[PDB]
Amino acid sequence: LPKTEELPIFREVAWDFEKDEPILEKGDFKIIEKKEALKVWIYKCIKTNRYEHEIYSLEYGTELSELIGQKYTKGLTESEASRFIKEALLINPYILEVNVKSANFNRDILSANVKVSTIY
Amino acid sequence: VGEKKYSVDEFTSRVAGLIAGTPLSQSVTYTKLSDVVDIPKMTKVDAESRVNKGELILIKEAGAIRIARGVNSLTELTAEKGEMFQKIKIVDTLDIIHSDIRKVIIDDYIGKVTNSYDNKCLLIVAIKSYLEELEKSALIESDSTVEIDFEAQKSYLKSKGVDLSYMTLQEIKEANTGSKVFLKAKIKVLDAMEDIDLSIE
Amino acid sequence: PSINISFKELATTVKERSARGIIAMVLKDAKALGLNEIHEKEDIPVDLSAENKEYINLALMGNVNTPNKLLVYVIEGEADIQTALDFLETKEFNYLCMPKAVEADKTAIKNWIIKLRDIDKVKVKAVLGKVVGNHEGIINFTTEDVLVGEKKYSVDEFTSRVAGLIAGTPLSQSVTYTKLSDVVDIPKMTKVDAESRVNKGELILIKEAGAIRIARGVNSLTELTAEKGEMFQKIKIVDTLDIIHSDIRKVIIDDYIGKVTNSYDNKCLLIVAIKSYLEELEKSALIESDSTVEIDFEAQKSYLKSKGVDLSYMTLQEIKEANTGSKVFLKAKIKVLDAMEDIDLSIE
Amino acid sequence: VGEKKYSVDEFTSRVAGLIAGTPLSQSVTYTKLSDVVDIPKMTKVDAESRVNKGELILIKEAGAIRIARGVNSLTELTAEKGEMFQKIKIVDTLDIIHSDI
Amino acid sequence: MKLIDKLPSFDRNYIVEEIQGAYDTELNILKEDIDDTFNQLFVDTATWGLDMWEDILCIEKKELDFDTRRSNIKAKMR
Amino acid sequence: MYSDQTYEVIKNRTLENINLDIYKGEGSFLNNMVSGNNLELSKIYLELSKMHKMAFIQDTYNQFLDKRVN
Amino acid sequence: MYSDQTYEVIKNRTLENINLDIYKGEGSFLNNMVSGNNLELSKIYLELSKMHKMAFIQDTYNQFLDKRVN
């Protein structure tokens, strides 16, 4: 019966997702709003598996490291990792849906395409 | 390993034993070792450099102690060797297929089997069947072709001096090979990824 | 060794445009002396004067929407016109207004605007208080003794307010008969004089429909030539013509100059892209849905005559297939929607 | 360039490197220069005159400093030379074909 | 030193490290406070606490050295 | 008591103690410091619970009993 | 010493131990989290002081009183 309240804008420090070091503005932690904090949250969730660290909550983290190393066949592991990423990302209430398109199998490199739908 | 001092040779023997028990469809990279508990500290940049030197090392990753790469000790891979020959996983299956083909040929065809066009066709069929067996495994690609080495047949004719003109190229295959066999085959071993990198929208 | 994963989201841009909803105003103050781009509402530099703040507040609200962008530059009154011209040349502007425009400054502004529109092809519009100039790019709002919210207002103040109102006006909507709730007190002024003033090419305010609104949305251009005519009398049409011109110029500059080779198939792809952009415009109600684009065949013939190659003994299609010497000749058909302010029908 | 005075030869080297980085599909005409911050003010008529001379100069176009032309330094063109020979892009592929043959 | 070990891979830089190091130093201070208090729990290890030990004994006097405090406590009982 | 005090409970308490524009999120760097401090504080709570019993005359160890009887 | 350390002194000490070019601004979420962690710190120090009190039983009758009397 009650109508759900919109999630307030998430704020956090900012960094280049390649630098991986929080860039700081004139001695003040940078402001990220609307479509900036969710990307940082997704990056944090994907980069580190939770079960490696006891401090993090059990539902947090991703389980893609099991497939890391070429343990099984690429064709099946594509479908498996799609569901793995969907489970690892759908935990955030901000994220609406996850869509994975395909995977590129070449030498010792995998390239894939995934999609995210959000609220703002 | 296990709070015990180990010489380099001891752990190389341990790693060789680990490799022997490694299935081919599985991997050698990032294999965590529960027995190893204590390791000297060594920076990530140093690990990257050492791996890029063609070496095999141990790192503490994913809450465990594992290796970083499954490349060969060969530092200098030539143009014909390349990236797919940098990996021990691929040279292993190449060696296995080579040994199996040599063994079956020695068992069956040398001396016992006569040299004939139909004998060559049956040998090609058998080799194709063995390649299909390998294709059932995920080690190699499912697409492959086997052919008679036509250029080697031409070279044999030139050695014999028989003119290549005024007969069909099929007659060259039908021609006697002087107790010799010339063949050609296509292969492609599966090469896959350790870690990934994708794109999002 | 360890190779890592990095994925960054990407969303395709839709309808990238330029010089849209931009308000440029330069004020003479001895305190700020600089340019200030206004992106957030109620962004007031402390250096600005109270009257300048009132100008900004007038520019703030729009009729239907807040104006997309307002840009303010400050410099001393001396040599103000030259520096304003230089700054507006530096950065594109959709509209221009001057708090203290003298007649000579207004004339210089109109001359600069028409010079850009004719030589530089920079389609821009300016708002002027009392100018009878012979160009449609300028706007002449001749309503003296304007009082808004029981407050005295100069002509330039309300011209700036009207420009801000226009910036917030959607193109599918109208500028005519726009009631102003802020304006409460206006001098009495007869209907016949309103008709005469509108027919003079001027913009005025009238009290109609229980409110204070304008009477017409025509251009300041009093004399529309045969090629300009009634549809060019309206600012609403010149606005969309300028928008389409700027968009086509921008996309051509981005894509084809130098980067794209000159070929028949390249020309065909360019025609396809232009047709797609025209279809995008046709989706909007600004223009008609029927349009055609063609290669300028007569220009091809003229280029051949300049080259001296005889036009006889080949197919006319070969003329299109012929090389154009790193040049492109095209033709296109357009028809901008023109519609009615007030109506007149019949009954039985 | 980048808030710094540069010698003419410095920018000729920069442009030569840019052209070496330019594929044969594209043409160096109307190429924006982000690094360059300012150029001396000059009339567009003089720019067209220098284009007729064949000299290559920068130009401030669309609010950006850009290359006016890819015309060759060849000032005098005979009757049979043609306009295409005035273009470095056109003669470039001819030179490439000559070298390959 | 413990927190950074528990910290993720992307938080291995000094910007993250400073706060964790300061808090680890503070918690080292806290744990040595725990050690001191546990010493205070036992009468033998408690030095300054011997005064209200004697107060529990309901005997009060200015005292020189903690060894004599403990001796007087042992003499007082039984 | 200290059994009620756990890493999750004191973590939520500390999060409430902070009035900040940053919305509380799992895996946040700030949340990382808060969680680490809470974990160590819960360990310290357990130590306090233990020294409850260790300070008692009963349930002593050989050295504890030795000190008490001395 | 549990009573030696108080809320604001250790708050300022923790703020000083932070050695960054980031200016320490009052009312910042960083200052707010320092305040919350110091709140829990003051709680644990006060509870340690209460533990010492309960061990000596100078007031607040306890089971410790009964056992020591026994």
Numbering used by the authors:
A (entry chain d): 16 to 135
B (entry chain a): 153 to 353
C (entry chain C): 6 to 353
D (entry chain P): 153 to 253
E (entry chain Y): 1 to 78
F (entry chain e), G (entry chain Z): 1 to 70
Excerpt from the publication:
Here, we report the atomic structures of an engineered diffocin, a contractile syringe-like molecular machine that kills the Gram-positive bacterium Clostridioides difficile. Captured in one pre-contraction and two post-contraction states, each structure fashions six proteins in the bacteria-targeting baseplate, two proteins in the energy-storing trunk, and a collar linking the sheath with the membrane-penetrating tube. Specific attachment of baseplate tail fibers to receptors on the surface of a target bacterial cell triggers conformational changes of the neighboring baseplate, which leads to reorientation of sheath proteins and contraction of the entire sheath assembly. Since the sheath and the tube are anchored together at the opposite end by the collar, collapsing the sheath pushes the tube through the baseplate, driving it to puncture the cell wall and underlying cytoplasmic membrane.
